[PDB]
Amino acid sequence: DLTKLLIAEVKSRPGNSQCCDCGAADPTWLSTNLGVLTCIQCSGVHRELGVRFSRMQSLTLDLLGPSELLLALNMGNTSFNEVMEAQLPSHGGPKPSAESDMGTRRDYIMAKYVEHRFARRCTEPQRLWTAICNRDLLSVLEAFANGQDFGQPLPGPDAQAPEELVLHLAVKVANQASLPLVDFIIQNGGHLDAKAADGNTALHYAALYNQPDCLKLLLKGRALVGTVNEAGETALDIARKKHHKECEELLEQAQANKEMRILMLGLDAAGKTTILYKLKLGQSVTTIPTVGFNVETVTYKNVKFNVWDVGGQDKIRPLWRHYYTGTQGLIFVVDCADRDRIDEARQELHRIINDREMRDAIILIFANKQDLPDAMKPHEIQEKLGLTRIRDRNWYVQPSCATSGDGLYEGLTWLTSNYK
Numbered sequence: 001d002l003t004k005l006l007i008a009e010v011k012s013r014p015g016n017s018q019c020c021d022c023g024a025a026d027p028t029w030l031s032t033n034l035g036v037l038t039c040i041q042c043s044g045v046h047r048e049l050g051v052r053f054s055r056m057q058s059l060t061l062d063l064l065g066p067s068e069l070l071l072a073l074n075m076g077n078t079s080f081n082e083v084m085e086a087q088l089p090s091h092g093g094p095k096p097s098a099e100s101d102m103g104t105r106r107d108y109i110m111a112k113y114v115e116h117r118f119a120r121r122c123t124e125p126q127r128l129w130t131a132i133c134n135r136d137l138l139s140v141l142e143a144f145a146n147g148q149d150f151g152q153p154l155p156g157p158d159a160q161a162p163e164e165l166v167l168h169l170a171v172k173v174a175n176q177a178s179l180p181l182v183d184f185i186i187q188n189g190g191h192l193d194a195k196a197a198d199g200n201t202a203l204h205y206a207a208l209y210n211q212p213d214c215l216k217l218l219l220k221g222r223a224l225v226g227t228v229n230e231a232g233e234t235a236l237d238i239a240r241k242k243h244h245k246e247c248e249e250l251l252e253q254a255q256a257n258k259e260m261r262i263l264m265l266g267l268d269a270a271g272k273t274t275i276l277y278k279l280k281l282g283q284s285v286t287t288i289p290t291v292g293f294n295v296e297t298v299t300y301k302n303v304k305f306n307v308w309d310v311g312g313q314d315k316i317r318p319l320w321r322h323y324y325t326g327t328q329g330l331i332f333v334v335d336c337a338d339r340d341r342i343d344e345a346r347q348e349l350h351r352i353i354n355d356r357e358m359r360d361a362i363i364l365i366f367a368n369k370q371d372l373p374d375a376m377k378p379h380e381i382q383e384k385l386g387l388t389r390i391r392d393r394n395w396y397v398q399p400s401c402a403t404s405g406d407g408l409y410e411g412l413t414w415l416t417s418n419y420k
């Protein structure tokens with residue numbers, strides 16, 4: 001109930017009663033890493049660009065923590081577009097309406113967020129250092145829009161013999177109000193485990209300057225602990241020297257004919273419908289978030305497949321149990337670029353295979369989205385999903401790229417095979 005308010009709060013920001021990308025009647029789909037709102041139609045294109053550019057959650061359908069809402073509560077659509085849709089003319093501008101076709105929709109959104117065409121332009125190492133300490137979120141966004149790359153560092157002020165990088169700074173000079181940028185940076189220039197000059201991670205710095213809520217945000221983004229620096233200190237070690245006890249409490253816990261009825265699960269935007277329909281149509285179709293579920297029958301090599309694709313949003317996952325009875329094979333789709341939510345996919349997969357109504361299930365796991373930059377390869381999936389120590393259950397991790405089709409029919413071929 002704490003969140004109910006913050007939800008309402010996010011919705012009431014300037015411009016957040018129109019879709020960020022097509023201005024449609026009050027949107028419910030949040031790009032958590034950009035703090036903006038889109039209609040369900042535009043929403044899907046974001047899911048297509050992947051978690052590298054945009055992490056989508058529904059305000060109505062996903063279970064949202066306060067921490068996830070930070071940028072949403074600190075940006076909104078008007079603030080954002082002022083930067084990102086800056087150089088857009090009012091007349092004839094390619095920005096679509098509530099019901100433009102997916103053709104025109106896709107093109108604009110891809111140009112806007114990936115290619116950055118319609119953004120206020122200018123380089124710049126100077127401003128970024130100034131904006132951060134000014135706590136000027138909207139200018140950090142301006143920097144991002146011109147391809148700044150928070151990765152490599154910036155030359156500092158007086159006596160500039162050493163070198164510091166973006167995130168390392170923002171953590172040093174932060175307060176309650178300064179937070180949004182810290183997150184915007186983590187989620188958008190994620191060189192989170194960099195060591196800089198004297199081997200200190202960004203995690204290290206937070207333990208030096210009494211920046212507690214900074215630590216919170218850092219670990220939330222899966223940060224490595226106990227990596228040693230030039231003084232060979234774990235992040236806890238420096239917390240000890242200056243005795244900042246609040247940081248120390250968080251660091252301690254941080255340590256620890258044949259027919260087959262198929263059920264296709266996995267977290268939101270895993271690729272589930274993309275898979276189902278590429279198999280049924282052979283051509284890759286565009287997918288909107290599947291709010292309910294989908295059923296199609298695909299025949300491949302004289303075997304009929306009754307596939308039940310179910311939507312993966314936090315709120316529509318308790319509904320999964322219902323589809324357990326009469327199920328032979330399970331397809332669990334995993335979005336492999338989504339490194340932040342693998343343990344979530346681990347949990348839900350385990351939450352199924354352990355259900356009493358399931359013991360006799362063949363498990364195919366699609367390790368989807370292998371085409372995306374930092375992939376996470378299939379063997380690394382086995383280990384992260386805790387399949388190392390699964391015996392007395394028949395599984396198989398299959399590399400896949402739904403968009404193209406690679407690895408899909410193979411998964412079926414494995415299904416055909418292990419159904420004897």
Ligand SMILES: Nc1nc2c(ncn2[C@@H]2O[C@H](COP(=O)(O)OP(=O)(O)O)[C@@H](O)[C@H]2O)c(=O)[nH]1
Binds near residue numbers: 402
């Ligand atoms: N690059 C890439 N994108 C994919 C792949 N599979 C799915 N997608 C995209 O991911 C977004 C989510 O697809 P979707 O089927 O709706 O996921 P689902 O809701 O869990 O079923 C879609 O826009 C797809 O275009 C893939 O293998 N590679």
Ligand SMILES: [Mg+2]
Binds near residue numbers: 062063064314
């Ligand atoms: Mg969640």
Ligand SMILES: [Mg+2]
Binds near residue numbers: 269271273274289310
């Ligand atoms: Mg779906």
Ligand SMILES: [Zn+2]
Binds near residue numbers: 038043
């Ligand atoms: Zn829209």
